[PDB]
Amino acid sequence: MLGFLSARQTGLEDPLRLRRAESTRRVLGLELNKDRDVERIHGGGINTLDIEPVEGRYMLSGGSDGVIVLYDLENSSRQSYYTCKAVCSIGRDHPDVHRYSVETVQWYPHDTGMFTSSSFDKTLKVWDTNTLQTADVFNFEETVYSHHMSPVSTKHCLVAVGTRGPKVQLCDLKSGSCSHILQGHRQEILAVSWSPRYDYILATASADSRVKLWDVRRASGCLITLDQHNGKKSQAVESANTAHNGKVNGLCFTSDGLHLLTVGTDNRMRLWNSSNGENTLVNYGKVCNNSKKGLKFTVSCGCSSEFVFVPYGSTIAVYTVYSGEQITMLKGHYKTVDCCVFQSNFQELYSGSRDCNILAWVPSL
Amino acid sequence: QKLSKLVEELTTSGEPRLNPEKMKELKKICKSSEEQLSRAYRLLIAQLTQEHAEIRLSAFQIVEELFVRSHQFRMLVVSNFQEFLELTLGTDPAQPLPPPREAAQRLRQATTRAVEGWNEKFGEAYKKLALGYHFLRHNKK
Structure with a gap:
């Protein structure tokens, strides 16, 4: 390293080098x-965790017992050892606590003052963080497996909701309109994820082994259906164009939003070009998941190399996104492990x- | 070597009882060299993976006494001990299917009491003992 400090100091390398290279070195040392x-x-x-996108200080956490815990991740004590104390909690006694497992919990991007949480009680509740009271409740006819708010939408404030119904529900938090539905899946939608790049692109993954990217503005169905083979096995699309050979219970756009990582119960992860849904043929080996519900996994950000952290049974398997190593x-x-x-x-x-x-x-x- | 000799002399189920002189000799030998205990775990996995439940009990007791006494098994059971966490999660809980559980119920009770002891015996930063105890108390004690 002292080479890295000397190179930063003398301008031989851009400081971006030391940041990213050191960020990577730190990730490898997890x-x-x-x-x-x-x-x-x-x-x-714990089914879900969410660190707030601005300032990364607080974490939400949704339990199978229905409680939502709000943690503070800053070491405010002077010791080198600390416990991330729980600031708030939607506990067993809260009048608005979820009746069943909280399956997803998400900070409102752009502001820490509001977060949303969806459960197996078929509700997506919007919370005021400060007063810790629900501001809104969306009821669904069917249990919610996952929802997701756009990390990028300065314009729209839609929540995509995946339930056991075959339909994707878009809930507009601006005047509450939970009617809009995306149709084209055939079984439960186990994972939904907005593009971090495009304001209105949504990727939705379902137990029918198919992943579809939608332009929710568009009135004409899915943009793309991810196909494992890219056309080697080509059929008039009625049952083909499966992303996986099982259920697809996980989605994650890479940081820059140019690729899509899908994990399905065929014990595979694939990397897709999010623009034309083409398969990049990154191997990744065998990724054990047999989760019957959504599998929440993440990517790294701001490193020399991107990583993906996938729950692998009782462990977190770390992979290099673009090489599979x-x-x-x-x-x-x-x-x-349910979520990282x-x-x-x-x-x-x-x-x-x-x-x-x-x-x-x-x-x- | 001598580790295996003591393991055979103690784990033998013909006299299945705790003998203090042999255990103190094992403690002193393990204290004399750390490399005695790193292979001792390999011996203990032989006794945990053996058919006879009394040999499993003996190897569990030997592991516990080396962890609590020798000061060299402590650096195996409270540091670089993910093998120990997995053996705790597999011993009392169900063996991963198809392979079922092969230990005896008295051995399950002994392991429960050992975990309850080790929750306070050595838990300065090793809280997965208590977490596993709670998981057992709420799933397959």
């Missing part, structure tokens, strides 16, 4: 921090799991 803990408040498994498998959970979320400021990873624990992975040294 290790279970026993010098950091997260306060145990979930009686049930498995960096490492982070082994610290006791039961299957990436803290882009410090290359920290938080992962919840069915054993009612949230483990912080921080770079070593």
Whole structure:
């Protein structure tokens, strides 16, 4: 490294080099921090985590017991050891607490004052963070597997909601209009994800092994259906053009939004060109998932090389996105891992799991 | 070597009882060299993976005594011990299917009591003992 400091100091390399190279080095050194803990408040498994996009200070967490916990990730104590204390909590006694498992929880992008949470009680509740009261409730006729707000939409404030119904619901938080539906899937939609690049592109993955990208502005159905083979097995599209050979229970756009990572119960991850849905043929080997619900996985941001952190049974498997090389498998959970979320400021990873624990992975040294 | 000799002398189910002199000799030998214990775990995995439940109990007790006494098994069970976390999650909980659980119920109770002891015995930063105990208490104790 001292070469890196000297190169930054003398202008030989752009400081961007030291940032990104060091960010990468930090990601490769991710290790279970026993010098950091997260306060145990979930009686049930953690299904979802969400670090706020602005300032990355707070984390939401949704449990199988229906409670939403709001953690503070800043070490406000002077010690080197600290527990991420829980600021608020939608507990068992809150009048608005979810009746069943909270399946997704998300900060409103652009502002920390509001977050949204969807459950198996068939509701997507919008919360005022400050008063911690629901501002809105959208009821669905069918259990919600995942929702997602656009990280980029300064213009629209739609929430895409995937339920066991075959239809994708768009809920407009600006005047509450939960009628709009995207039609074209055939089984439960297990994962929805807005593009981080395009304001109105939504990718939706379903148990029918198909992933569709939508232009929700458009009135003419899906843009693209991801196809494993890109045409080697080509059929008049009625059942072909499956992204996977099982259910597709996970979606994640890469940071710059130019590629799409899908994980399905064929124990594969694929990398897709988000513009024409073409398969890049990145291998990734075998990625064990048998989750019957959505599988929440993330990518890294602001490193020399992009990484994807995928729950792999009871571990987090780290892969290089564009080459497939498995960096490492982070082994610290006791039961299957449900969600991992990436803290882009410090290359920290938080992962919840069915054993009612949230483990912080921080770079070593 | 001598580790295997002591393991055979202690794990033998013909006299399945805790003998203090042999255990203190093992403690002193493990304290004399750390490399005694790194292979001892390999011996203990032989005894945990053995057909006889009494040999499994003996190897569990030997692991526990080396972790709590020798100061060299502590650096195996409270550091670089993901193998220990997985063996705790597989011993009391169901063996991963198809492979079922092969231990005895008395061994399950002994492992539960050992986990409850180790929750306070060595938990300065190793809280996955308590987390596994809670998971057992809420899933397959």
